[PDB]
Write an enzyme that holds these catalytic residues in place. Structure first.
Site, PDB file in Angstrom:
ATOM      1  N   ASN A   1       0.850  -1.387  -0.083  1.00  0.00           N
ATOM      2  CA  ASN A   1      -0.246  -0.101   0.016  1.00  0.00           C
ATOM      3  C   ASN A   1       0.896   1.275   0.111  1.00  0.00           C
ATOM      4  O   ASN A   1       0.269   2.206   0.044  1.00  0.00           O
ATOM      5  CB  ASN A   1      -1.067  -0.007   1.276  1.00  0.00           C
ATOM      6  CG  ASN A   1       0.016  -0.047   2.234  1.00  0.00           C
ATOM      7  OD1 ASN A   1       0.808  -0.755   2.576  1.00  0.00           O
ATOM      8  ND2 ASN A   1      -0.750   0.327   3.603  1.00  0.00           N
ATOM      9  N   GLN A   2       2.023   1.087  -0.147  1.00  0.00           N
ATOM     10  CA  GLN A   2       3.215   2.337  -0.049  1.00  0.00           C
ATOM     11  C   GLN A   2       2.761   3.133  -1.192  1.00  0.00           C
ATOM     12  O   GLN A   2       2.402   2.814  -2.255  1.00  0.00           O
ATOM     13  CB  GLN A   2       4.440   1.855   0.113  1.00  0.00           C
ATOM     14  CG  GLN A   2       4.611   0.645   0.610  1.00  0.00           C
ATOM     15  CD  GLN A   2       5.869   0.012   0.788  1.00  0.00           C
ATOM     16  OE1 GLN A   2       6.632   0.818   1.575  1.00  0.00           O
ATOM     17  NE2 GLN A   2       6.391  -1.053   0.306  1.00  0.00           N
ATOM     18  N   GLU A   3       3.094   4.520  -0.932  1.00  0.00           N
ATOM     19  CA  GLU A   3       3.020   5.472  -1.963  1.00  0.00           C
ATOM     20  C   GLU A   3       1.351   5.744  -2.355  1.00  0.00           C
ATOM     21  O   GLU A   3       1.275   5.681  -3.656  1.00  0.00           O
ATOM     22  CB  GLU A   3       3.933   5.142  -3.225  1.00  0.00           C
ATOM     23  CG  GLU A   3       5.353   5.273  -2.918  1.00  0.00           C
ATOM     24  CD  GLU A   3       6.087   6.579  -2.630  1.00  0.00           C
ATOM     25  OE1 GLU A   3       5.551   7.514  -3.230  1.00  0.00           O
ATOM     26  OE2 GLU A   3       7.076   6.575  -1.589  1.00  0.00           O
ATOM     27  N   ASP A   4       0.639   5.947  -1.337  1.00  0.00           N
ATOM     28  CA  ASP A   4      -0.782   6.144  -1.797  1.00  0.00           C
ATOM     29  C   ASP A   4      -1.607   4.912  -2.336  1.00  0.00           C
ATOM     30  O   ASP A   4      -2.479   5.183  -2.887  1.00  0.00           O
ATOM     31  CB  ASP A   4      -0.889   7.510  -2.574  1.00  0.00           C
ATOM     32  CG  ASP A   4      -0.233   8.723  -2.011  1.00  0.00           C
ATOM     33  OD1 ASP A   4       0.421   8.557  -1.001  1.00  0.00           O
ATOM     34  OD2 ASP A   4      -0.690   9.696  -2.537  1.00  0.00           O
ATOM     35  N   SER A   5      -0.927   3.849  -2.362  1.00  0.00           N
ATOM     36  CA  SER A   5      -1.592   2.660  -2.811  1.00  0.00           C
ATOM     37  C   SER A   5      -2.452   2.174  -1.711  1.00  0.00           C
ATOM     38  O   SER A   5      -2.580   2.496  -0.630  1.00  0.00           O
ATOM     39  CB  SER A   5      -0.367   1.574  -3.252  1.00  0.00           C
ATOM     40  OG  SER A   5       0.409   2.010  -4.249  1.00  0.00           O
TER      41      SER A   5
END
Ligand SMILES: [Zn+2]
Ligand SMILES: [Zn+2]
Ligand SMILES: [Zn+2]
Lengths: 147, 53, 74, 65, 53, 92, 49, 45, 56, 279, 98
Positions: A1-5
């Site tokens: 979920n990193q970087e607005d995932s």
């Protein structure tokens, strides 16, 4: 979920979460020029007409329309439109066997699919018989969608 | 279908309807059957007729 | 009030729902009385598109149930 | 738009719970939070579902076929 | 048809599965985030009584 | 006194569909009259019959505004007055 | 196994946007070209490049 | 001659060319498509 | 440069005609045949060429 | 020269080609042997979307106007200059006539179809010593009659004769030769709903009237000698049937028929109305 | 803004007419030395005379607007420091309720 995932539960998707419908409207019309050339809505056939799109045609009715409630795939002739032309006009190849008219259909977008929802036939201000077509499709949430 | 609901919409909801399944082992996995798209020992056929009156 | 002159020439009241489907334009005609003088009755001049839900539209003050009849969301 | 089948997170079948829930307010005039206690969605993965559902299909049926 | 939840959630024999061990955090598997005291703020689990203090 | 701030909102006015049609209609009506003069001139000029149907051009107005709304044109001289309605969501 | 750290949790309103992936992904290997310049055409709908 | 549907009447029209584009028993002006009699098939998977 | 740039040539005397590829014919449906502006302009100039030819 | 290209699969060459065109891949392929015949197929789709070719043809003229980077001395300089070369063609009559019919059909609310259909008629003849002029108006309005009839509608001559007065004598006489020229260069049934249109009645009148209209001529009763008169006679014995009062007073001011024709036609059709009971 | 509305414009004639009847000294006869402390009166930015007791005039106006005598969309401003009283009835001003 990193970087607005994000990370979305699969089962919730399976239970309809964020599911949504999609409705595309195809409309086409026959335009006569000087009441000499008569664009026509009918089911074209790969034999008596020339220069036809390599998609299938069988989903058409007699009049060149697709019955509603019929599942369709990409590159399928939604509307059967034909245009008469003079047999000795251009001689663009094989015109010396057909002499009738050339295909001017409006196929489905090759990347689309689903069920034809409803088809209506009516006229413009000037009595020109024409048709709108609406296609229904469900867009399940998927990996790339933007929330 | 003449509802105000989409076909697959209704069809999808039909999928999420629980059925009594105590003797599920007494059936055969859908791919295991040599059946023609189903069989009495492979599946259960359900029908529904509804009419607003 | 809004209406449409169809292909034959017939002119009948136009309803907004029909307008969208049949690619019409939700308008109404204009008519002016003209006085002509020679010195020593009603004249049509044109149409006019009408804002939906305006005072002159058929949907001006229709009932909620009537709106459902005309297939226009309240 | 109409009483979704089992709550996405949990999965407790929640379709049958609707009308009973509606029966409560128009008849017993309960508070919703107290209502569900009577109703029996004691968890809150469902307690959301009935609470925030929209019954759009009702307004849909106003269109004569 | 006989399906298994791993494919689709419709074939789900079960709903929310509560699950807990070590109600008192005596195994130190978790550090309680707190402002003044974990005990005053974090409520005890329903099963904390079922095991010794 | 300060230099007059021309970004002050009190010095701004908003022209809605009413005035926008008005001035656009103002010219369209004007062109109607001028044409009616032309037909009125020639009949006096040439002692011909005077027909109001002949005198007045119906499709001046109607085909005028229809195009004037079809595209944001307000004549060049203006762009983007008319946009197709965005029915993405009810809020939108 | 118990997570060493706790989690912030709870419902929150979320909305779905237009930009579905299926309306943004395309590829091209010797498709049609323009007429004026014979460089490849643009637009995924018309099989752009 | 193929089946069509009047815009409100929900009337069988089953008409062909050279027919008054209109509904029997009611002068309606728009025609629907009167969906096919061959079945559809679905997967709720 | 008297081999490639003679200022006499700076004043047009014979204008060339670009082949069709430079000014392709927009042929749509075998009847809706659009033409580039240069096609018309070349015709338009040719008319202005035509008149001045005979008019004098 | 013979200036012709026709695709032919060299490996097969079995016939005038039985091939396909993979538009997405922009090629053409031998449907049997699979060899790509020609590649780099060129799109022709997006070219016309940005965009009178029917009638004038290759006679060219480009509509123009002032620019933004231009003074008032540049504005009316062009408006004076844009008219000094209109002599080169005799489509100036046409460019006024095609304008004129464009004024004509639209003003009385004819459908846009008739605009070109009338245009088709005028450009068809445009020159004949049988015309040799001929008042310059029949070539307009009879062209509309040729246009509108070709546009599969029709209006009565008075609705056009009063629309364009050409004394109706040479008008029709030169009108007829247009059909002969039409044949050399190659109908009350539509008058039905328009007549009831202005009077605002329900839809079932016309077919009921049409059934009556069909019966009159076939047995006998050429009925009119210029039978335009009995077009209304088909209608009036139907309005005499129903109780809505539209007596010949109102028809006489709307459809403009003398009661000498109305009453005579009505009663002679009262003789044979016995065989005219449909429901 | 959710409360915003746009003025549709009215006929200013009543106000100006009303103004004269309440001590607006007509501009054609204005003698600035003879009334040094006058209050200039504008209507849609169109000077129509001067006054001498604006405070009496001002609250008299608003009362009429609140009475509905003056249409409420009509904006009127008393600018003390400038000795100027302005009135607007133009079509297209942006106004909100309060
Ligand atoms: Zn089986
Ligand atoms: Zn749950
Ligand atoms: Zn081959």
């Amino acid at each position: 979920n990193q970087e607005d995932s994000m990370i979305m539960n699969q089962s919730s998707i399976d239970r309809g979460l964020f599911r949504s419908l999609f409705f595309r409207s195809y409309m086409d019309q026959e335009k006569k020029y000087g009441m000499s050339i008569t664009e026509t809505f009918e089911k074209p056939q790969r034999t008596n007409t020339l220069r036809m799109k390599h998609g299938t045609y069988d989903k058409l009715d007699d009049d060149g329309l697709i019955a509603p409630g019929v599942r369709v795939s990409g590159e399928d002739v939604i509307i059967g439109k034909t245009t008469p032309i003079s047999p000795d006009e251009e001689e663009l190849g094989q015109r010396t066997a057909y002499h009738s008219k050339r295909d001017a259909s409006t196929p489905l977008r090759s990347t689309e699919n689903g069920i034809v929802d409803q088809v209506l036939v009516t006229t413009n201000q000037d009595g020109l018989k024409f048709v709108k077509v609406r296609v229904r499709t469900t867009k399940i949430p998927q990996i790339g969608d933007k929330f | 279908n003449t509802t105000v609901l989409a076909d697959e919409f209704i069809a999808h909801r039909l999928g999420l309807i629980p059925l009594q399944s105590m003797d599920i082992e007494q059936l055969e996995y859908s791919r295991d059957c040599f059946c023609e798209d189903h069989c009495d020992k492979c599946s259960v056929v359900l029908t529904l007729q509804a009419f607003g009156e | 009030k809004p209406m449409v002159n169809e292909s034959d020439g017939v002119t009948h009241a136009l309803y907004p729902q029909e307008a969208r489907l049949r690619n019409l334009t939700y308008s109404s005609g204009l008519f002016v009385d003209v006085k002509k003088r020679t010195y020593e009755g009603k004249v049509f001049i044109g149409r006019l598109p009408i804002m939906l839900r305006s005072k002159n539209c058929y949907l001006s003050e229709a009932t909620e149930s009537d709106l459902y009849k005309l297939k226009e969301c309240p | 738009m109409i009483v979704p089948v089992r709550c996405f997170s949990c999965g407790k079948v929640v379709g049958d719970k609707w009308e009973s829930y509606l029966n409560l307010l128009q008849e017993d005039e309960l508070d919703e939070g107290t209502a569900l206690s009577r109703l029996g969605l004691k968890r809150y993965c469902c307690r959301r579902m009935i609470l925030t559902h929209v019954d759009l299909i009702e307004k849909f049926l106003r269109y004569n076929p | 048809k006989k399906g298994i939840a791993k494919e689709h959630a419709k074939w789900g024999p079960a709903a929310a599965i509560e699950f807990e061990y070590d109600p008192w955090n005596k195994l130190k598997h978790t550090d309680y985030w707190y402002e003044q005291d974990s005990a005053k703020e974090w409520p005890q689990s329903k099963n904390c009584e079922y095991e010794d203090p | 006194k300060d230099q007059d701030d021309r970004d002050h909102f009190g010095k701004k006015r908003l022209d809605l569909a009413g005035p926008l049609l008005a001035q656009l209609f103002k010219t369209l009506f004007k062109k109607l009259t001028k044409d009616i003069f032309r037909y009125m001139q020639r009949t006096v000029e040439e002692a011909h019959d005077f027909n109001m149907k002949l005198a007045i051009n119906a499709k001046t107005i109607t085909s005028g505004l229809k195009y004037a709304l079809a595209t944001g044109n307000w004549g060049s001289s203006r762009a983007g007055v008319s946009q197709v309605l965005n029915r993405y969501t009810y809020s939108s | 196994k118990k997570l060493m750290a706790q989690i912030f949790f709870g419902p929150t309103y979320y909305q779905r946007l237009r930009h579905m992936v299926d309306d943004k992904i395309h590829a091209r290997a010797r498709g049609p070209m323009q007429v004026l310049t014979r460089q490849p055409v643009e637009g995924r709908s018309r099989d752009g490049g | 001659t193929l089946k069509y549907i009047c815009a409100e009447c929900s009337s069988k029209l089953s008409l062909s060319r050279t027919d008054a584009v209109r509904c029997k028993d009611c002068g309606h002006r728009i025609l629907l498509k009167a969906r096919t009699k061959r079945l559809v098939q679905f997967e709720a998977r | 440069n008297e081999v490639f740039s003679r200022p006499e040539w700076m004043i047009l005397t014979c204008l060339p005609v670009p082949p069709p590829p430079v000014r392709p014919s927009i042929s749509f449906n075998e009847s809706q045949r659009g033409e580039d502006d240069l096609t018309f302009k070349l015709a338009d100039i040719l008319k202005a060429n035509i008149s001045l030819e005979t008019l004098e | 020269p013979n200036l012709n290209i026709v695709l032919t699969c060299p490996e097969c060459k079995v016939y005038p080609p039985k091939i396909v065109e993979r538009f997405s891949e922009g090629d053409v392929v031998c449907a049997l042997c699979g060899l790509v015949l020609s590649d780099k197929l060129v799109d022709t789709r997006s070219e016309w979307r940005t965009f009178n070719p029917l009638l004038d043809g290759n006679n060219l003229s480009t509509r123009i106007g002032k620019g933004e980077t231009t003074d008032m001395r540049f504005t009316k300089e062009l408006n004076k200059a844009q008219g000094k070369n209109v002599m080169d063609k005799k489509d100036n009559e046409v460019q006024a006539a095609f304008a004129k019919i464009t004024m004509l059909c639209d003003a009385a609310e004819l459908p846009k179809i008739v605009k070109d259909c009338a245009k088709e008629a005028y450009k068809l003849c445009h020159d004949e010593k049988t015309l040799k002029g001929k008042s310059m108006e029949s070539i307009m309005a009879a062209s509309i009659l040729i246009g509108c009839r070709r546009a599969e509608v029709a209006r009565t001559f008075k609705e056009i004769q009063s629309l364009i007065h050409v004394k109706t004598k040479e008008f029709g006489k030169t009108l007829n030769i247009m059909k002969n020229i039409l044949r050399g260069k190659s109908q009350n049934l539509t008058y039905i709903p328009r007549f009831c249109s202005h009077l605002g009645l329900p839809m079932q009148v016309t077919t009921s009237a049409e059934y009556t209209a069909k019966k009159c001529k076939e047995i006998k009763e050429i009925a009119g000698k210029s039978p335009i008169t009995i077009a209304v006679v088909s209608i009036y014995l139907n309005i005499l049937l129903f109780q809505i009062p539209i007596t010949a007073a109102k028809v006489g001011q709307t459809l403009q028929v003398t009661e000498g024709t109305i009453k005579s036609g009505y009663k002679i059709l009262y003789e044979h109305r016995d065989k005219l009971v449909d429901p | 803004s959710l409360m915003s509305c746009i003025s549709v414009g009215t006929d200013p004639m009543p106000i100006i007419t009303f103004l004269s009847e309440w001590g607006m000294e007509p501009l054609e006869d204005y003698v600035p030395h003879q009334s040094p402390d006058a209050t200039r009166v504008f209507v849609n930015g169109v000077w129509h005379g001067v006054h001498r007791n604006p405070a009496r005039l001002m609250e008299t106006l608003r009362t009429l607007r609140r009475k509905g005598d003056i249409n409420p969309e009509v904006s009127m401003i008393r600018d003390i420091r400038e000795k100027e009283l302005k009135i607007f009835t133009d079509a297209g001003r942006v106004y909100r309720p309060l």
